[PDB]
Structures are given as structure tokens and as C-alpha cells.
Amino acid sequence: TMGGYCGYLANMGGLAAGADAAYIFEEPFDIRDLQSNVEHLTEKMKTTIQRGLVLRNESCSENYTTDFIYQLYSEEGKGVFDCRKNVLGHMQQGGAPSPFDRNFGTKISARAMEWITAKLKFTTDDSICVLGISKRNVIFQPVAELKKQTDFEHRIPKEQWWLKLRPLMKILAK
Amino acid sequence: GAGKAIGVLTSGGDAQGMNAAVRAVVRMGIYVGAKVYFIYEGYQGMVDGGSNIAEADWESVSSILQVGGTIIGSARCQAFRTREGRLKAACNLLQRGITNLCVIGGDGSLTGANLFRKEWSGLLEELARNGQIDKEAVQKYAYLNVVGMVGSIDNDFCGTDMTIGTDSALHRIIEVVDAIMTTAQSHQRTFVLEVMGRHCGYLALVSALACGADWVFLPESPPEEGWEEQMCVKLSENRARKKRLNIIIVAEGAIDTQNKPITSEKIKELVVTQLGYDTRVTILGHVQRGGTPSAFDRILASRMGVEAVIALLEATPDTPACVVSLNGNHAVRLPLMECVQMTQDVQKAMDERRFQDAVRLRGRSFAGNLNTYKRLAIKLPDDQIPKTNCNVAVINVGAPAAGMNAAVRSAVRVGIADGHRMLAIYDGFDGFAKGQIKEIGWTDVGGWTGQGGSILGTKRVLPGKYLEEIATQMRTHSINALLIIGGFEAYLGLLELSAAREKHEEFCVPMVMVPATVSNNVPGSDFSIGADTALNTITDTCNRIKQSASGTKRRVFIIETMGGYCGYLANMGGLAAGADAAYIFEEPFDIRDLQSNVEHLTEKMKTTIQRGLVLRNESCSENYTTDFIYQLYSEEGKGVFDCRKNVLGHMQQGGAPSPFDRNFGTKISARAMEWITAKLKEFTTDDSICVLGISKRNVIFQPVAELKKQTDFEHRIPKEQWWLKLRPLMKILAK
Amino acid sequence: SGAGKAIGVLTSGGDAQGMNAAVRAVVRMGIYVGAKVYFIYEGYQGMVDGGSNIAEADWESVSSILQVGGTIIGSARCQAFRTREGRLKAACNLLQRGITNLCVIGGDGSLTGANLFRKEWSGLLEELARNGQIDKEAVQKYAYLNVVGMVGSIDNDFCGTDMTIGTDSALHRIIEVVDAIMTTAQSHQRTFVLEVMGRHCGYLALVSALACGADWVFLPESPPEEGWEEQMCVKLSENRARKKRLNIIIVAEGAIDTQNKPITSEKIKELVVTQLGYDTRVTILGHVQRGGTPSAFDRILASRMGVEAVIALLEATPDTPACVVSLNGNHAVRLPLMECVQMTQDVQKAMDERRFQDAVRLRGRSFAGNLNTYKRLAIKLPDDQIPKTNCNVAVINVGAPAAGMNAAVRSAVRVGIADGHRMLAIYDGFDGFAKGQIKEIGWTDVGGWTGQGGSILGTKRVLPGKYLEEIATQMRTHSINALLIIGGFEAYLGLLELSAAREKHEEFCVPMVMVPATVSNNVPGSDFSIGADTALNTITDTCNRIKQSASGTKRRVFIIETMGGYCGYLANMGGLAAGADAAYIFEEPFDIRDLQSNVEHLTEKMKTTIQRGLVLRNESCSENYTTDFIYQLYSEEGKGVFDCRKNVLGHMQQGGAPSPFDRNFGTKISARAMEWITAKLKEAKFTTDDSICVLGISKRNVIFQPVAELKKQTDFEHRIPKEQWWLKLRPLMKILAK
């Protein structure tokens, strides 16, 4: 899946679709974590669920590319499962937006316009701000103090909220 | 075997690949858990001792596989000949517990180890007599086993086919001829060369056969009576028959009818008084002993290096001394007491005439090479040729393997000397359907030895889809015999020609197939024409890549060699170049064997040899591709070693024909034409469509009707091979 | 341009390697811009007789001869042409085929006979018309004959230019024999003596011995000092103490002593036994030096002069004297034949007398530099006589493991040792500099380093930007006051980072010099780098072996992707020497129409006898037009005429045995680089911009250009300089393949 270095579409996608694995850039993984997923996948072929779904970020690893996971799963599973590979293109950002995004684009844009009418400091760093989601309400954070919690090398923030869901997901796989 | 200690040494004659021998000797002894010790200065280091007896490890015999000569130092001692100094030499071995000796020398130094194994009970009893050693030492280190290794380009020791340094010295002789074959074509002239070998002359026989000379001077078989008049006529015959380049190969001690050597200066004066051709004498000095060892010698030294270690621990306390040597595809051991007799027999056979038996004593390899050159360089007149009114045509079908032109030159000249008219089916089966067939003669294949690629032309096109054009074109040129010189594509064609016997009657003629491919996947044959050319090219390219891998510290180069599904170029290329791993299709492997190689490669970075050579077959697996090995070695090797990847490609084939294939194609093609003449006497059975292969040492004609079972049509490789026995020998030489 | 006239090419006298590459460009040039071109077989012997030795040449007759040494024309002893007794018949055959322009490829007495043919051209024409054999209008139509001379002797007897056709190829055969002996004499303690091909000019004995690192050379121009028999035995005894069990003695074909008596190799064999007692086997390389495949340097030089001579034929007015074309620098020039013979007469004049010093300086500027550098590198003054300046000079290899970098450290240290400085070695490049690994190395440590590729010191493509404080710590604990970097673009970027650190760290104010060492010629400010000829000879030789696989499997075109980043030096120069039909570099913009025009050209050439195809491509020629794009396009657009394959070379291009050119190249610029370091070291203020220069090549001499000014003519985005010199050969390359 796409998304650059942010594994939001791979982490949340593997949780809703019920994927057995979701390799993202924010979690490092070697060949042992890759082999453990195959050894746990071989035991799954002895049950009723004789299928397998594994997700991967667009740029989760420089060497463990999409073909690397497809090549390792095919040889290490020769005779117990025949695996294939597929790359999702720009179809993810499709046509009709989701009903959640219909209200998301309307709810926070009105508060962003209310912030414009309220202010118009005058010539500082907080006049240029963002509109983020803290817990339940919104928050206006200036773009100046948003440099220590982000990584400009990968275009993703440093600490992410949905990373606390990685403890889960696994317990729903094997 | 374990617990014992082995001491390797080099004394006497030297040759290329000597460092490759001690590389396998040390690494094999460490693998079986035995102490290896270097003995510098040959036998002189044993008498001196102190610093000349040093222990060896796995990091000492590395980066020297490609270095010619020896790093120990081939010396000629003098104090070891006396028993007084031999007692000091024996006590020096007792200090480190050296109870096994491995003498990788020339010829004369191997006798000194024989006298040391008989005086072992006398010298050890003298040390305890002096009180310098304890009584348990003479009982624990009671018997000394010795082993020898042929390591000299003289090749005076008989009993085998090829010794260490023969193919390397042959390479240096051919490499000089190639510098003249592409130079002396501007002006007519004749070059006279002088090779080494005073009482052997084997280097002058195969090198002249490979380069296609006109006259050879051998110490065994002297030239015929009146050779000063016969050689001048032969040099004058080629002057008017389109040949502006004549080669005269002379030995170091080539004698005549008596014991008077024929110097190269008399030959220079012989061609200047009655011939007048511009002749320059070139004496190949010690350049034959130099240069990088060939891929055939590096495999030979690595095979005998392991065979010499297993010949020491398995040696019983009452066994004679032995000299390891290669015997076809599975080497054997020869007793030292009998190998010296054959040397004294050849000498006496050369003394007082009796040259007729000196050729037969040298074995079938000398007799086979002598008959091949005599029937190829001596052309009888056309009016004296018994024409059998039969048309024999040659064809190249498959990949443009190197040395293919050297096989056609022998296939046409022998076919004419047998009494037939020779044709040339150009472009392979593609030109067979097009009609690219033209009559060629003796002067048409002039100077073909030394030109890689293909002159007739080869295509991977198979019949059946164009069989209607093959059946029509065959019944027009009156083709009665067929000879195909190609790879696996030639085998698939002969199988289709066998099924079209009743529907098409013209395909009931005897058809013999000659293997010619770098993949070496031809069923029924162990070797193939062009395999040594790619083998000597892959390992040389790996050396040029290991050089950059040694320059930039901590670097591993994933190299993908060609060859289809056959792992001949991958396994033999991994043994002759000292690769850390050679992944082929015949040996499966998972991610555990791949990770075990990374852990094996990670510990290598902690030593002085911070490099890594790993090769992969062209199609070893559909999943573990070349990039898969490159991606795994880069991610799992992060922080310990960087790694790149490089694919060789078609650069391995189509090069300068290696001297092995210059004679391999020239030898079996003359025998393939004899199989045609033996069958062209009177067709309706299966013994007419066969291939020419190598079983153990000789050749055999296996019919393609029965070869359908011992082959894998799904992978174009034979089911059972011969080089798979070297798989454990190659894996134990990489830590 | 000019057309209509005929051109006559011939090869007489000295015939060296690459001569077939010369007639390949001479024939194909006269067809592209002029009319008919004619072959003159047997050199001057074919002019006297003629008939069959004068045949028309076409584009399909000089193809498969590019990879063949010697000459396809031939030559012989012609006594009926040098004298004016049968020369009238030689001047009678050119009027038949209308040949009014001649091109001689000799270099010895053949070029002299061409000038006598032009002066007598106005005299032999009136005699042939008087005897009643030619037409009156013809004696005025072809009354003017323009000729051009081309050098082609391995002896380098033509003292006009510095490097001629055949010098690099003959040097290859000399080193190839030395490298073979270097793996045998290590068994038994011995010493070999080689006799090179240097009769009247010892240029071959100088650069060949400088490459292999010999101990003593016998030159026919510079004689040994009186008493050399006792001095060489002591010098040969010194190498026995420095653990150098292998000694090489290079002797010329006619090396003389103080008098005019030649010093034969047999006399040296009788000399090493009267005071030394070592084993000695005399070796004489006869005609094996003139043989072999032509080197990449000669295949380009013969192709460049194979085009310039035709240009210097029709452009030359009928009143200009005869010119001998020679390559020297960016643009080749024409040298008058009457003035070049004058220098040969002056060289032989000083060689007959005892004024040998004026004969060495007259031979050229490169011979004086090669003689002064080797004499200071081979002869080591005693340790107690070394004027130590209490200064530590460091050498480092930073960048790609290019060949010849092992030889650059040999020339840098031993020159600095004799200059009076203790030498430190920084291993593993800049990665080791920040990690330490600084160790003193001396004369015996770099013993025999010339002959190994890669870097014994170790190389790294790591920029010294972040790891900077760690380098400064190792700069003070070892007291390094000078640093010499041997590398490519990574060394240029590193020196720029060291320029911005002088304001920060203080120990970086020491003088520094970078020597180009890359296999791509991407070094800005320099036109040549160490390892270029090694990779160039590797690509062209490998591409030639690939052509043999094509010349066989007929109707096959091979797509080869070379390395070099963005600098198409290996792609363009490799295509000029290997005869590639096309070379796609980044600096040459190309579209789908130009790519298809090459396909149309290939389909027409398949109908000829040359049914093969070689096309090269730099790895980063285009982000969209990849290597497989050429393979995918040429296959579908020729499915019924020619198939195609793909071969990515890779790291096989670099590494290996350093080329003879790269051997002497790295040994020369590194010696002059330390001379700059020693001169800048003597100042009893070090903060300047002229202490971080890069020893580059402008035309013939060297130049020290600081990195403060090289920022303008460089492209940091493409790793190549903006304006390159070899881009002028772009039209010269594509016109040789129609």
C-alpha cells in the first residue's frame, strides 16, 4: 500500500482487513521476524482458514521490498501454500470520499475559517499554525514548535498515536 | 582422523598453483581438527628449525590462491642429506608433535621423505638414547607417514594424465602464440619456439596441437630420417596453400636419432639457407612458470590438497609413500616406489634408440595426442585420397561456445583425410532450413584454432517447426552423414530427428553429436567444449572483483554466473576462485542455509580477510533470485559489511579459446569423424543417433534413445552428474 | 569540406599495434566526406609494381580489423623506391586511379621518403609525360600532391611528439611478461634481466621500468656514470637487505656506456657473478613487444589521428609543406615533416658525440620528467644522509577502489622520504581517519606495490562532514602537517568540506593536495584520473570478446551498460575504441527519434557481412530511457532482422592489474604532488585557499587548481564537471559507424 513512510494505511489496514502481518517502517524487522511469520503461517494451513493476508508499507525497508516478501513466502511455503503478490496503485485515493471524510472535511474547515476571522498575532510564528486532533477536540499548534516531534527525512512525525495499537493486532492473528 | 599434526613443505621444482595446493592442505587439516605447520626453505628449515616451523591457520592460506609460485619457498637443501643434520631435523618435528609430513615438491625432493620414513625408528631411538626426548614420545610419535604431490612443469613423473602446473604453463605458451597469430599475418614468416621439459616433451605436444603448428621436436619420438628435407617441404607447402604463418615448437632437450640435442639455432639456419623465410628464434624461458594459475590447475591443486591430507591419517603404519595425482574424474593415489621406476624406464627407453616404446610408455594421453597431431598436420595429396563418394557435413547448433572453431578445423581435415568431401551447414538449423550449405576444403579451416565464437554460425532453433525444410534440403546436397557440435540444443534436435524416421526417410543416417557449451549440461558427457574458457574467465573476473572487494574493506559481491540450470560454472567457479558460497539448482537451500552463510560471513570480517565471494547460478531458483541474495546480505549485514551485486552475462563465453578447449575440440572431433567412417561402410536402428561423452577417462557413444531417462527435460540438465561429489570439498574450504 | 579526389593510405617501415585501427578511421573518413579511398599494399613495395596492390576500400572492409594487431596492408624491404631508379614507376600508378592525396603511416624512414616524393612530384610528372605514358592535361591536373605522415613505431624514434601509436600497446606486452615473472622468482632467489625494444630511442625502457618499479635501467641516450659496474652491484646488494628478493634490470636494444660501445645483456649476466653471486636468467623480448591486441589508448589515438590526417589532406593547400599529424592535449595539431626530420637529425648528432645531456632534453618534455622522477624514486640515498625536516606527511585513499591507487602511495612516500619527511599512512580512507589506523610506513613497506589493484591502505566513499572532530583528534596525536588524498569526486567534496572547517578546527590549516583517482574521469579540474586506462582497456577488451559471440550468432546486437555514474568517459571513449555503433551518454541529449534512427541504421548494416551490433550506455544516461528500454526497443523494431541481448558489466570494469598507463600516471602526478607539499612545507600563515588544490591536467603540463575556483565549472547534482574535453570527440565517434 501507499502512504510513503507512514504505516498508517498498513497498520490500520491490516487490523480491519484481518491481515496476519503488517510490516511498516516504524517497526524494525529482520529475517527472524520474517521467518516467524512464515512458521506461524504454515501452522495456519492445517486449520479451516487456509488463506493468508500480509500488508507492507510503500517504503518500510530499503532491502525487504514487496518482491522480497513474495519471494521468501513462496519458497519457504513450497508445498503448503502458493502465494502471490499485488501492488495497490492510486486506486486507494479513489473517487467518492468516505462518509467519515465528508464530515471531517467540513467540521475542521469551519473551525479553521473561524480562526481566520478571529485573528483577521500579526507577524510571528503562531499566525502560521496547524489544525490537529489531540484527543476529542481540535488544537491549533504553531508550525514553529512542531519541529522536535517530526522527522523531515521520512515526512512522518516522530511519536505517533496509533503505534500503541501495535501491541494489539498480533493477538488477533496468531 | 584427528589429534595428529601435519607439516607441509615445498622443495625442488616450482609451478603455478603451488599456493593453491598448500591452501587446501592447511584448510583440510584444520577442518578435521589437526595441527598444520609450515616448513620454510624445504628440508633446510627442518634442520635449522626455530622460526622455520610455524603453525598455520585459516587466515594464512587466504588471498594466495591466485598467486603463482609458492609462498613457502622452494629451496634445495644440503645438510638434510646427512644423518647428522637429519637428527637435528627429526628432533625439530618432535617439538611441535609433527607426526605427518606432506612434501609438495617437484620430483627429486620426494625421495628425501622416503628415507625419512625408514629412518624414523632409528632417529627417534637416538633422541631417547641421548635423553633429549621422553620415552613416551618415541612410542606416541612412533611412525611417520609421508605423502607427495607433483608440483613441477617438467612432468617427468609418469603414472597420471596431468600434474599441477601443466595447464598453467600451457596457458603461458599459448598466450604467446596468440600474440603472434594476430600479428604475423602482415608478412609471411615462421616463428620457432622453445618450451621447457628436457625428458618429457609433453608441453610441446599439446601446445603445438592447440595452436596448430607444422612440426614438433620431441625428446621421445625423434623426427624422421631426413627431417631437414621433410620439414622444409612442409614449410614450403603451406607457403602456397594459403598459410602465411608457420609455428615450429621445439622442446628444451629435443634429441635426434642419437643423444645429440637439436638446438633452435640449427633450425634457424635450416630455414634460412634453403627456405629464406624470415625466422626469429624465441626461447620461452621461465615465463612458462609464471602468470596466474589457470582454473583447471586451481581445481586440481584444491582437489589434491584435500586428497593429500586424507592420504596421511588413513595411511597405515606399514603403507608405502604415495604421490597423489588426478585420474580422470575421480583421482587416485600412486606408490612412490613405482613412480620412480617409470621415470628410469623412460630414460633407458630413450637411451640407445628404442624411441618406439618411449611413446607407448607415456600413456594413452601422449599416444592419443601424437596420433591426432600426426594425422592433422601431415596432409596426403588429394590424388592419393580414397574417395568414398560420401558427403559429410558439420554444423553448430546452440550457444556460441568458445573453441567451437577449433573443433570444426579438426572435423573437416580428418574428414578429408578419411576420403570424404566436407560441407558446412552455416547458421545451424536456421541455415539448414534456409540452405546455407557450402563445400569447404583443407585450406578453408586454416588457422581456425584460436578464434572464439563461431565461424559457421549457430542458432538455438530446433527442427519440427521447420522439419519440412530440413527434410527437403537434406535430400538435395546428398548428405549421408551428420555431425553436430553444440550444447543442449543439439541434444533436443537429435531426439526430434529420431522420431521423424518413418514419416521422413532421409533422417535414417548416422548422426553423432559433439558437446560444445559453457553450461556443461549435455547429458551423457562430463565435460563440454568451452566450459574451461568460461571457467577461466569467471574466476579471473572474480579475482578482478575480489581485488576491489579487498581494496574497499568489508565488501561482499553477489555474482550471478550463467549456465542455465546447470551449476558447473557456479560450483567449479566457486572452487577455483575460493568463493564463500556457490548456490546451484541441484543443491536446494532455504532461508536457514542462507542465514547460516551470513553468520559464517560475519565471523570472517573479524579476521584479516574482510572480504566475501559468493556466486549464484543463473536459474538456481525462481524465488531466491540474485537481488534476493543482495537484499538479504545488505540488510542482515548492516553495520558489519556493505554489499553490492554484479551479473557477468555473455562475457563468460565467446572469448579467447582456452588451451584446454583448443585441444578438447581438436581431439574428440577427430574421434567423432572416426565413428562416422566406422559406420559409413554399408541406419535402421538406434545406435546411429548417439552423442560423444566422457565417462571416466576414455570416451563413449551413448545413443539418445536411452538417454531420455537420465536427463531432466524440465531443467535441461542431466539427472546424475560427476562434479556433485566436489560439493563437500568446496564447502569445507570456506571456514 | 572536400570531395572528388582520391586518398591513398599505406603502412611502411615501422608497423606497430593499432595500425589497423588507423586505416579503419582513414578509410571511413575519406568515404564520409570525400570520394574514393584506396589501399596501398606492402607499403612502398606496392607503389612500384601496383596493379593488384592498389584496390578500392569501402566501409565494410575496415570493420573486423579494429581488434587485430599489426597491419592488414603489409610491408617489406623496398630498394626500388628509396633510390630514384624505379621510383618513376611508383609515381606512375597513382595517376591511373586518380590518387592525388597520400597518407603514410610509418614513423621511421617511411616519413622521410614521403617528403622526397612531394619534392620530386613536380619532377617525376614531367618525365612520365615525356616518356609518352600519361596525358598532358593530367600532368597539370594532378601537378600538386598533398601528403600527411602518421607515426607508428614502438621505438618512438620520431622525437617530434611524446606518445605515438604503438607505445602503449608495446608497453603492455613488456609489463605482462614482468607480472608473470613476479610470481616465480619468489621461489628461488634470483634476478632477471630483460631487453626491451629500444634501439635508437630508449623511451620504451624508461616508462616500462618506471611502471614495474625496476632497480636500474640502461638507456641508449643517457649513459650510466663511469663506474656503474661497482655501483650497480652495491645497489643490487641493497635490495637484498630491503627484503626485495626480486630484482629487475631493464636494458634497451642499443644501450651504450660512456663510449659508443653497446651494453649487452650478456655483459650484465657476467657482472652479477663477480661481486654478488646471485642466479640470473637473461630474457630478450624480440618481436613479442610489437604483437598482441592494441590497447585502448592506441585504439583511440590511431582513430583520432585516423581522422585528423584526412582533415589535414583536403584542407591543406597545395603550397603548404608536408605535415605529420600528432595528438597532444585537447585538440590535435599538425607538425611539419621538414621540421620533424630536423629534430631527428639533431638527436642523432648529439648521440654521436659525448654530449648526451643535450640529446635527452631534445627528445621531449615527457622523457625528461620520466627520467628525473624515476632516478629520484629508484635511487635511495642513505638513511644517515636524509635531510629530515621534522615533519609528518600523510597519504590517504578516499573514494572508489580504482586501479593504480596502490602505485600512487608508492611514489608519494618514497619521494617524501627522500625529501626529508617521515611518512604516516591513514588506512581505510576518511572512515579510518576518524577511527585512527594511522601508521608510519617507509621504503620497504611500499616495496613492489606497483602491480596490485584496489588499495592496500583501503578506500572509502565516506564524506568527512559529520565525523570531523574525530579526525582532528588523530591529526594532533600524530602531528600531521600535510595530507595527500588519492581519490575521485569524494576527495573533491572532502577537500571542500575541509575548507569550511578551517574557520572551526585549527589543525586543518595544513597544506593539502588531491590526486585524481577514479574510473570515470569525473574529477573536476582534471582531464585524466588514475584507473581510467585500466577500466578503458577492460571494457574494450571485454566488449571485443562479446563481439566474437555476436560474430557467430549472426544478426545479434548486444546492449552493454557501463559504469561511471554520469560521466560518459567510459561509454564514449569505450565506444570509440571498441567500435560501438552507438554510445548513449547523459551529456548528449537523445530522444525517441534519434534512438529509432540508430535502429534504422542497424537494419541496413545487417545486410552487409558485418551482422553484429555493439551499443553502450552509461548507467545514468536517462532516468526514463533505461538499459532495458534499449533492449526492449531494439528487439521489437528488429524482430525480423536482428535480435538483441543485455549485459550489465558492473564492477568488472575497474580493479585488476593496473594498466601500464595508470602505472606510470599515478607514479608521476603523485611525485609532483609531494614536490608541491615539500615546497609549501618550507616556510619558517598556513591559512590560505591555495593549500587545498587538486593536481589536474590542462593540456600537456600539470596545473595546481585550488578548490575555491573549481566550484564554478562543476555540477554537484550530476557528479561531473560542466564542460568536458572529450565531448569534442562526439561527432568524431558517430561518423565512424555511418
- Inspect the interface and report whether the beta carbons of C650 and B650 lie closer than 8 Å: no
Shortest CA gap B11–chain C (Å): 9
- C612, C602 contact by CB (below 8 A): no
Cβ-based contacts of C405 with chain B (< 8 Å): 551
d(C-alpha C248, C-alpha C693), whole Å: 36
d(C-alpha A111, C-alpha B217), whole Å: 104
- B287, B121 contact by CB (below 8 A): no
The conformation of residue A122, written as its DSSP 8-state character, comes to -
- C565, C719 contact by CB (below 8 A): yes
Q: Checking DSSP bridges between strand B245-250 and strand B215-217, what pairing results, if any?
A: parallel
Amino acid at C11: T
- CA B252 to centroid of chain Cα atoms: 23
d(C-alpha C458, C-alpha C396), whole Å: 8
Tally of CB atoms within 10 A around B507 = 23
| Interface check B69 vs C, CB under 8 A | yes
Q: Give how far Cα B483 sits from Cα of B26, B411, B413, C324, Å.
A: 47, 9, 14, 55
Give the residue from B666, B8, B659, B575 showing the smallest Cα distance to B291.
Answer: B659
d(C-alpha C394, C-alpha C396), whole Å: 7
Catalytic residue among B14, B154, B214, B297: B154
The conformation of residue B394, written as its DSSP 8-state character, comes to E
C-alpha cell at B689: 543417433
Q: Which of C183, C281, C454 sits opposite B69 (nearest CB)?
A: C183
d(C-alpha B442, C-alpha B438), whole Å: 14
Which of A33, A66, A71, A74 is the best residue to mutate to test the B interface, defined by the most B CB atoms within 10 Å of its own CB? A71
d(C-alpha B177, C-alpha A148), whole Å: 72
Positive or negative torsion for Cα C371, C373, C379, C381: positive
- B104, B22 contact by CB (below 8 A): yes
Q: How was this structure determined?
A: X-ray
Give the residue from C165, C140, C65, C54 showing the smallest Cα distance to C99.
Answer: C54
Amino acid at B161: D
- C575, C582 contact by CB (below 8 A): yes
- C723, C714 contact by CB (below 8 A): no
Q: Closest residue of C to B457, CA-based?
A: C552
Shortest CA gap B248–chain C (Å): 16
The three-state secondary structure class of C426 is strand
- Inspect the interface and report whether the beta carbons of B290 and C545 lie closer than 8 Å: no
Residue given cell 610489437 in the structure block:
C290
C-alpha cell at B367: 599416444
d(C-alpha C521, C-alpha C563), whole Å: 11
Residue B154 among the catalytic residues: yes
Positive or negative torsion for Cα A4, A9, A12, A14: negative
Do chains C and A meet with 3 or more Cβ pairs nearer than 8 Å?
Answer: no
Q: Checking DSSP bridges between strand B145-150 and strand B53-55, what pairing results, if any?
A: unpaired
d(C-alpha B498, C-alpha A118), whole Å: 94
- C249, C214 contact by CB (below 8 A): yes
Q: Which of A34, A64, A75 sits opposite B621 (nearest CB)?
A: A75
Question: Taking CA C295 as the corner, what is the angle to CA C150 and CA C160, rounded to the nearest 5 degrees?
Answer: 30
> B239 phi and psi, to 5 degrees?
-65, -35
Q: Which of residues 392-411 of C touch B (CB under 8 A)?
A: 400-401, 405
d(C-alpha A119, C-alpha A116), whole Å: 5
| Interface check A47 vs B, CB under 8 A | no
Cβ-based contacts of C646 with chain B (< 8 Å): 649
> What are the residues whose beta carbons fall under 8 Å from the beta carbon of B461, sequence distance 6 or more?
B397, B428, B429, B430
Tally of CB atoms within 10 A around B502 = 8
Cβ-based contacts of B182 with chain C (< 8 Å): 68-70, 291-293
Tally of CB atoms within 10 A around C369 = 17
**The three-state (H, E, C) secondary structure of B383-433, written as one string:** HHCCCCCCEEEEEEECCCCCCHHHHHHHHHHHHHHHCCEEEEECCHHHHHH
Q: Which residues of A90-107 are buried (b: 16+ CB within 10 A; e: fewer)?
A: eeeeeeeeeeeeeeeeee
Q: Please state the length of chain C.
A: 738
The three-state secondary structure class of B484 is strand
Determine whether C534 is exposed, middle or buried from the number of CB atoms within 10 Å of its CB (0-12, 13-18, 19+): buried
d(C-alpha B518, C-alpha B488), whole Å: 10
Catalytic residue among C155, C168, C419, C533: C155
Tally of CB atoms within 10 A around C339 = 12
- B545, B633 contact by CB (below 8 A): no
- C413, C396 contact by CB (below 8 A): no
Which region, left, alpha or beta, applies to residue B73 given φ > 0 means left and ψ of -120 to 50 means alpha? left
- Radius of gyration for chain A, computed over Cα atoms and rounded to the nearest angstrom: 20
Q: Which of residues 459-488 of B touch C (CB under 8 A)?
A: 459
- C409, C393 contact by CB (below 8 A): no
SS3 content of chain A, % helix, strand, coil (to 5): 35, 10, 55
Which region, left, alpha or beta, applies to residue A155 given φ > 0 means left and ψ of -120 to 50 means alpha? left
- C736, C579 contact by CB (below 8 A): yes
- Inspect the interface and report whether the beta carbons of A62 and B635 lie closer than 8 Å: yes
Amino acid at C432: G
> B619 phi and psi, to 5 degrees?
-140, 60
Q: Is A45 part of any known ligand binding site?
A: no
The secondary structure element, H or E, covering residue B432 is helix B428-434
Q: Give how far Cα B222 sits from Cα of B207, B246, B350, B360, Å.
A: 17, 20, 10, 14
**The three-state (H, E, C) secondary structure of B143-185, written as one string:** CCEEEEEECCCCCCCCCCCCCCCHHHHHHHHHHHHHHHHCCCC
Q: Give how far Cα B342 sits from Cα of B24, B157, B350, B363, C201, Å.
A: 28, 7, 12, 11, 53
Amino acid at B102: C
Which region, left, alpha or beta, applies to residue C218 given φ > 0 means left and ψ of -120 to 50 means alpha? beta
The three-state secondary structure class of B543 is helix
- B463, B497 contact by CB (below 8 A): yes
Q: Give how far Cα C588 sits from Cα of C36, C714, C716, C722, Å.
A: 32, 17, 18, 13
Shortest CA gap B384–chain C (Å): 35
Which of B593, B621, B631 is the best residue to mutate to test the A interface, defined by the most A CB atoms within 10 Å of its own CB? B631
Q: Which of A31, A74, A75 sits opposite B632 (nearest CB)?
A: A31
List the beta strands (DSSP E) in chain A.
21-23, 54-56, 132-133, 138-139, 150-151, 156-157
| Interface check A33 vs B, CB under 8 A | no
- C325, C149 contact by CB (below 8 A): yes
- C6, C99 contact by CB (below 8 A): yes
- C539, C651 contact by CB (below 8 A): no
| Interface check B602 vs A, CB under 8 A | no
- Inspect the interface and report whether the beta carbons of B635 and A65 lie closer than 8 Å: no
> B126 phi and psi, to 5 degrees?
-80, -30
Amino acid at C463: L
Q: Which of residues 110-129 of A touch B (CB under 8 A)?
A: none
Give the residue from C565, C501, C499, C559 showing the smallest Cα distance to C529.
Answer: C565
Cβ-based contacts of B623 with chain A (< 8 Å): 71-72, 74-75
Q: Please state the length of chain A.
A: 174
Q: What is the largest CA-CA distance in chain C?
A: 92
Question: Taking CA C223 as the corner, what is the angle to CA C220 and CA C229, rounded to the nearest 5 degrees?
Answer: 120
Q: Checking DSSP bridges between strand C216-218 and strand C248-251, what pairing results, if any?
A: parallel
**DSSP annotation string for C35-85:** S-EEEETTTTHHHHS-SSSEEEE-TTSSSTTTT--S-SS-----HHHHSTT
> C415 phi and psi, to 5 degrees?
-70, -45
- CA A132 to centroid of chain Cα atoms: 18
C-alpha cell at B482: 551428420
- CA C151 to centroid of chain Cα atoms: 15
List the beta strands (DSSP E) in B460-502.
479-486
| Interface check C601 vs B, CB under 8 A | no
Give the residue from C275, C243, C443, C315 showing the smallest Cα distance to C7.
Answer: C315
> What are the residues whose beta carbons fall under 8 Å from the beta carbon of C698, sequence distance 6 or more?
C329, C527
> What are the residues whose beta carbons fall under 8 Å from the beta carbon of A164, sequence distance 6 or more?
none
Amino acid at C242: R
Q: What is the largest CA-CA distance in chain B?
A: 93
Breaks (C-N over 2.5 A) in chain A follow: 120
Experimental structure resolution, Å? 3.6
- Our CA dihedral for C509, C515, C520, C525, rounded to 10 degrees, sits at 70
Amino acid at C684: A
| Interface check A74 vs B, CB under 8 A | yes
**DSSP annotation string for C559-582:** EEEE-STT-THHHHHHHHHHT-SE
Spatial strand order in the sheet of C392-397: C438-440, C422-426, C392-397, C480-487, C512-516, C692-697, C702-706
Amino acid at C494: G
d(C-alpha C708, C-alpha C687), whole Å: 13
Tally of CB atoms within 10 A around C65 = 18
Residue given cell 588429394 in the structure block:
B382
Give the residue from B512, B571, B514 showing the smallest Cα distance to B539.
Answer: B571
- Radius of gyration for chain B, computed over Cα atoms and rounded to the nearest angstrom: 28
Cβ-based contacts of B590 with chain A (< 8 Å): 75-76
**The three-state (H, E, C) secondary structure of C681-728, written as one string:** HCCCCCCCCCCEEEEEECCCCEEEEECCCCCCCEECCCCEECCCCHHH
Give the residue from C448, C529, C515, C450 showing the smallest Cα distance to C672.
Answer: C515
- B315, C322 contact by CB (below 8 A): no
Tell me the sheet residues that pair with C703.
C696
Q: Is A113 part of any known ligand binding site?
A: no
Q: Checking DSSP bridges between strand B245-250 and strand C216-218, what pairing results, if any?
A: unpaired
Residue given cell 543463473 in the structure block:
B618
d(C-alpha B626, C-alpha C372), whole Å: 51
Q: Closest residue of B to C546, CA-based?
A: B651
Q: Closest residue of B to A34, CA-based?
A: B591
Tell me the sheet residues that pair with B118.
none
As a whole number of Å, the end-to-end CA separation of chain B is: 18
d(C-alpha C37, C-alpha C99), whole Å: 9
Cβ-based contacts of C454 with chain B (< 8 Å): 547-552
List the beta strands (DSSP E) in C387-493.
392-397, 422-426, 438-440, 480-487
- C486, C460 contact by CB (below 8 A): no
- Inspect the interface and report whether the beta carbons of C70 and B182 lie closer than 8 Å: yes
d(C-alpha C382, C-alpha C418), whole Å: 9
Residues placed in the known binding site of C for substrate: 153-155, 190, 197-199, 253, 281, 287-290
d(C-alpha B125, C-alpha B137), whole Å: 10
> What are the residues whose beta carbons fall under 8 Å from the beta carbon of B713, sequence distance 6 or more?
none
Shortest CA gap B107–chain C (Å): 16
Which of B583, B585, B591, B625 is the best residue to mutate to test the A interface, defined by the most A CB atoms within 10 Å of its own CB? B591
Give the residue from C556, C545, C562 showing the smallest Cα distance to C645.
Answer: C556
Tell me the sheet residues that pair with B9.
B39, B103
d(C-alpha B77, C-alpha B151), whole Å: 17
Residue given cell 578453408 in the structure block:
B444
> What are the residues whose beta carbons fall under 8 Å from the beta carbon of B658, sequence distance 6 or more?
B171, B294, B402, B403, B532, B533, B535, B536
C-alpha cell at C287: 618481436
